[PDB]
Amino acid sequence: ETFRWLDSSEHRRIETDGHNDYKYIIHPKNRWYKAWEMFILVWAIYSSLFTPMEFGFFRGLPERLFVLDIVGQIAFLVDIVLQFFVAYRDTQTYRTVYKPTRIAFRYLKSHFLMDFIGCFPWDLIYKASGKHELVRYLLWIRLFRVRKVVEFFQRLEKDTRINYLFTRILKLLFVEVYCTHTAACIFYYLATTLPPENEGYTWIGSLKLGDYSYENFREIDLWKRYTTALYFAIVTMATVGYGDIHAVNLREMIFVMIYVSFDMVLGAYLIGNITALIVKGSNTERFRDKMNDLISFMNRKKLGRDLRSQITGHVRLQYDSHYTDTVMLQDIPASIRAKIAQLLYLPYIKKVPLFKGCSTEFINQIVIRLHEEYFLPGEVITEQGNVVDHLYFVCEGLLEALVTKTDGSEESVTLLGPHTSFGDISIICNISQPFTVRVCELCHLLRLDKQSFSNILEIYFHDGRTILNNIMEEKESNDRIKKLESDIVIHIGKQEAELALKVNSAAFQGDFYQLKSLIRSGADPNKTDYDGRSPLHLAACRGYEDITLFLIQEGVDVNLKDKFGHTPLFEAVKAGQEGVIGLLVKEGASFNLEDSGNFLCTTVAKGDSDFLKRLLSSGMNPNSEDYDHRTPLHVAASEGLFLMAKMLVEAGASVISKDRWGNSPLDEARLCGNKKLIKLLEDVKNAQ
Amino acid sequence: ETFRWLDSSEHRRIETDGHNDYKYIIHPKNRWYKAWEMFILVWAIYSSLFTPMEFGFFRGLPERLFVLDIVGQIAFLVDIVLQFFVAYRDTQTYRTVYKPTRIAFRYLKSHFLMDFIGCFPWDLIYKASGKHELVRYLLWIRLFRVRKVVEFFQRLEKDTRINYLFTRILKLLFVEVYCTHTAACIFYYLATTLPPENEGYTWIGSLKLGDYSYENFREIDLWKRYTTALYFAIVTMATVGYGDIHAVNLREMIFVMIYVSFDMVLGAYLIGNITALIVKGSNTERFRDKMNDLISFMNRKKLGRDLRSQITGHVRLQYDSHYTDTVMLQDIPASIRAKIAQLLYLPYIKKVPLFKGCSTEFINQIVIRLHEEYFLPGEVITEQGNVVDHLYFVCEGLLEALVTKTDGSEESVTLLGPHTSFGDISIICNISQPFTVRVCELCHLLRLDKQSFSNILEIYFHDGRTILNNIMEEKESNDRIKKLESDIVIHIGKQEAELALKVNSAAFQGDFYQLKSLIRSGADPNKTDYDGRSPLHLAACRGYEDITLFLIQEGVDVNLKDKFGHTPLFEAVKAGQEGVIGLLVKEGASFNLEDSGNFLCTTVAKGDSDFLKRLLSSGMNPNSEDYDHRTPLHVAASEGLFLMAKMLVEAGASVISKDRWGNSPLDEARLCGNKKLIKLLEDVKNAQ
Ligand SMILES: [K+]
Ligand SMILES: [K+]
């Protein structure tokens, strides 16, 4: 869809069209060609100012000024053939065309014939062809050399160093003059169009200024006639109009009626462009607008006389110096603002002594969430005895940490220069701010919030431990005030003591994404502290999964005996459950449990056919016994209990096995009737 | 808090302070104080225009124009004594003070002396005082009668029919002139401050225009002198300046330097205010800068040509006629916009034949959600075979319902004039749109979306049934074309049984508020559904117990048997909920099953110790026998299940109750078991 936007994308394709072939076609940014563009601009300015002066004030040029306009035509005849070898920075397909058939074309159907007619000698042709008046009107073709001046004001309007509404004013002020030069030349020419005997019916032949009479006006010096005509044209253009010089003919009345009608529109356009420049306000009135919007809300909220002088100081600081333009920056998205922040703040954050060699992603997460702030001298930022809500890094300036003993004894603890941080020994700790950080010189602090430097400090636990090691590998803070806190927060175990607990709570709640974000960054253990549990002992069974993917990941060790003697098969089968005990047994789960016979006798005694069939179905041999070496059939034949020893004996258990009293389950079952389990034991007994 | 809000508040308390006492004080907005505020306005205009003409052009008035300035002074002394009997609106409050001591004061410390010493006859005590030309400078105090005109231009920006910026240029055009009348008068006066022998060194005494020499200028008539001076002052004010009349003295040079310096900033202020009038632009360029924003997005999206006319026909219906300023409506809050909608739209919706006999709160609930729309003729709105998504109410204009059957031709089945809403029978009779409703005259449709006219229809179900039974059934409601469909609108399945389903549905998961609202809007008479269930059936135990209070519910009859034979306590015993089976004994709490003995006889065979304890602890009569005259204890002894026959025999059951065989449970236990249950039922056999 880049064919739709060829301007927003594909801006500078440079590679495959610089030196295709022909080795001659100059790119229109060459330093040897832009030294010719100014030369032809000076020649075009001269040749457009002299052309109405050649038309109006002469009838054929004299014998002097002949080599001058000969070389003036030569310096443009060079530029005529030089534009066949200049490229074609294009409009729609944004690439400089080098093809010298699209250079000969796009020029021959453009400003060539108006620029080739204007290099014929029109005052040798005039003096050769019988001195005809209408062949001297072809000098006016040479006013097409104001293209080189209007192209200069188009290469200046797209120059961002100068405001475009100021280049429009300069363009209108170059249109205002040279329309008074040309009007002066035409106003003198309309006096030369009458014969010298009718010179008393002209604007200049009938002129008398002071004691000087302008009679026989073709014999006055050229710079008196030109200054007289230009004085008329400029006091007419400015609409002063003294009337010492005025139109007398009808051909001068018509020209003045055209010329003041042009200058009225031109002066109204100049006033409009100047007003449009001024309504785009300056720095001082954009300061004073929000300053009077902030004096109110400081007069009706009744803020104190010191907080008012701090607010006015910061408003006068964001204007008049230090143009912090984040309010313009907020249109830029978060990725490009993060790239700007990694360009601007990484030279300052990487030299902070708190971050002695952390990971680059952690410093990236720091510099993503930074803010620039400026404070005047005398400000208090964090005072002693309050909670720390922001972490500050001094980019440049000079700060001062102080402390008081009893009576306001403000002694200089340290002087926080550039590449220093304060508020760092209380976000790590949970204590008050220990120092009144006061400002000495105009500073440029970088502010990080407390909650950001808890989230990115608990996520990046290796770098957090590195930060705590940077804090303790010091003089143990006796450089400041010897406020030693234990050894900070000491090594607090986030390797195994809390991270195994964190991944186990992630398995218990059933969060698969938190589980795999923890274990895919390494650190998958098989043990919890404070117990013998595992991320298989929790999730898999007791929780019974939440999330079916909790068993496939990494193949963790099954049959791990915990602190209470429970394998994860036993935890999966106690809560009953029927997916993990169907799924764990193919992974090699086992029912290892000490005194399993006594446990089976207690589950006979309570009475739970579902629990005991899940024990036997998931793998259990009911010939293991207790302290009196009694099989579960020996207790399932004690209190009657049919249908409980049936599911035992279909799972496989012999009848002939004695006890402390020397009784088998045969005659132990001979306390109840014939159907009551004695037929069952005898026909599973004599079946082999 | 409200004392800050003084003039932005209630502000209408003049009623108590109107005529306390003092019996003379005229209210400012009287009618006889508006035949004075224009009479002496056109007296103040005359006296303010004549005062520089009396000063400049005369050296004392003639014997005529004597009664004129006599009555001109006595009219202003009539005003100077009539301003003592006029109340005034206070500045900081908004109450008209009527106290005739704060009328004499606030006036005497204000413009009273400048309106009293400009009321002495300054021509009578000039000519009768040994005439000195410095008691004629006290005529200029009568230019404090321009207070009336600037008060008229202060009581004109309070009006709302004209713009406040057009009044600020009309005030400037009254300041532009009369600063040329005063300048003409005190430009002629500076010519009369020279002696008549030095009259050739003035602007008028040395003047010669045409062939008329202005010599001995004190004997020319008054209007030639005034027109000459005013012509100079007006061609100077406009900065034209012909120079036929110019300053000659030094006092006239000084006055012209003051005057053109004043008129320069006055003309710049006029140009600025006229520009500010045009920056707040007109509607014919508020349309053109909106429509060229709609030329793109109709070219960059490549729309059709009938849609590009349908779009642009609605933006010259927004602007250029029918000024719908609803974008200026949405900053008004939703309560006040609801009151606006109740004021405007309610006579339109009250006359729609859809709503004949609806409740007032229903009509108030649909007029909040309306929208105004305008359509040009020829447009279709809802075509045939399309899903309806809006409901339309016609205000004015004329629509046309059209339907096409086979050949593409349409027939005018109904002309929809005002109060002839359409789009109604495709939401109640929930089918596709059956017509192609086309605009034949510029209309004012009121749009309600389909989703709101489902929610307000289902909430107000009585008004919904009222809508779908009164809908032109007296005039065969398919009265556009035939529309052969059996039972279109007459109770197609929404009845007074479905709210019982809604109570049962909300009760099944438990809500405490939807069933409470449905029994407040309706009732709880234990209405049922197909299976004979109840809210006591579902809310208690089918869906498991949500609140304990679901079983009381202001008094519900317990033991309501459904079609299956289940009671709401049998649902408890099958479900569990020992707190619910503790609560249900408060009511009658019977367990009437016909095969209750067979149900106990099969629950001793399935095998249940907890379910049987919930059966017997709630009251079950645990010796009732099945078809074979077998008790529950009969089967519990024949199968020989210990711990279940115990639970039967402590709950009260006869142990010698025989069966169809005549076989007691005594010898049934002896044939089944050698345990023989002798400390279980033989000891309760010999208990009697
Ligand atoms: K002007
Ligand atoms: K002028």
Curated annotation (Swiss-Prot), chains A, B:
Range of residues in the leader sequence: none
Tissue expression profile of the protein: Expressed in guard cell-containing tissues, in root epidermal cells and in root hairs. Detected in vascular cells of the root and shoot.
Extracellular compartment residues: 59-65, 131-136, 193-227, 248-253
Record has Ligase as a keyword: no
TM ranges: 38-58, 66-86, 110-130, 137-157, 172-192, 254-274
GO biological process: monoatomic ion transport; response to abscisic acid; response to calcium ion; response to cold; response to jasmonic acid; response to water deprivation
Membrane topology, record value: Multi-pass membrane protein
Ranges in coiled-coil conformation: none
Molecular function, one GO term: monoatomic ion transmembrane transporter activity
Induction of its expression: Up-regulated under drought, salt stress and cold conditions. Induced by abscisic acid (ABA) treatment in roots and shoots but not in guard cells.
Residue ranges annotated as intramembrane: 228-247
Record: residues binding a nucleoside 3',5'-cyclic phosphate: 354-476
Domain notes: The segment S4 is probably the voltage-sensor and is characterized by a series of positively charged amino acids. The pore-forming region H5 is enclosed by the transmembrane segments S5 and S6 in the Shaker-type (1P/6TM) and contains the GYGD signature motif which seems to be involved in potassium selectivity. The KHA domain (rich in hydrophobic and acidic residues) present in the C-terminal part is likely to be important for tetramerization.
UniProt-recorded name of the protein: Potassium channel GORK
Species for this entry: Arabidopsis thaliana
Phylogenetic placement of the source organism: Eukaryota, Viridiplantae, Streptophyta, Embryophyta, Tracheophyta
